[PDB]
C-alpha cells in the first residue's frame, strides 16, 4: 500500500516568516491545509500545503544555495546525487566546481521553490 497521511514523510517546506525552502519532515496536520514541519536543523513551524514539497529530491539542473561545515554559504546548480549509509547528498556545481553537499545543506531560494509548488505541492 501507499505511505501514511503526510505526517512522517521527509519533504521540503517554506519557513513561514516569508523565507526560503528548507528540508524537513511533516510532524502533524495543524488544520485546514497547514502541516507542522520539523526542519532538519531542529526547528519547527506551521506551513500551508501549497508551501510543502513531497516529491522533491532536489532536481538536477536546478539552482540552489549550498552550505559547508566551515559555515561558508553561496549558490550554484545541482549536477549529481549520492547516498551514504542512510542519508542523501547533492553534487552542486558552484563557482564552476562540482562539490558534494548534504540534503539539508542544499537549500532552495523562494523563486526556485515556487517552480516546484506547482508539481510537488501538498495543496
Amino acid at each position: 500500500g501507499h505511505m501514511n497521511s503526510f505526517v512522517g514523510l521527509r519533504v521540503v517546506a517554506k519557513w513561514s516568516s516569508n523565507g526560503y525552502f528548507y528540508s524537513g519532515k511533516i510532524t502533524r496536520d495543524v488544520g485546514a491545509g497547514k502541516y507542522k514541519l520539523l526542519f532538519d536543523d531542529g526547528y519547527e513551524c506551521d506551513v500551508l500545503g501549497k508551501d510543502i514539497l513531497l516529491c522533491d529530491p532536489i532536481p538536477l539542473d536546478t539552482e540552489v544555495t549550498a552550505l559547508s561545515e566551515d559555515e561558508y554559504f553561496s549558490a550554484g546548480v545541482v549536477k549529481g546525487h549520492r547516498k551514504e549509509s542512510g542519508e542523501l547528498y547533492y553534487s552542486i556545481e558552484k563557482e564552476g566546481q562540482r562539490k558534494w553537499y548534504k540534503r539539508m545543506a542544499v537549500i532552495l531560494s523562494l523563486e526556485q521553490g515556487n517552480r516546484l509548488r506547482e508539481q510537488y505541492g501538498l495543496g
Binding site: 516568516s17 526560503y20 528548507y22 531542529g42 526547528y43 552550505l67 559555515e71 537549500i107
Partner: peptide, 12 residues
C-alpha cells in the same frame, strides 16, 4: 559577525 544566510545561522 557571521558568514551565513537568512535563518540557518542556528546555534551550531
Amino acid at each position: 559577525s557571521t558568514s551565513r544566510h537568512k535563518k540557518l545561522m542556528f546555534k551550531t
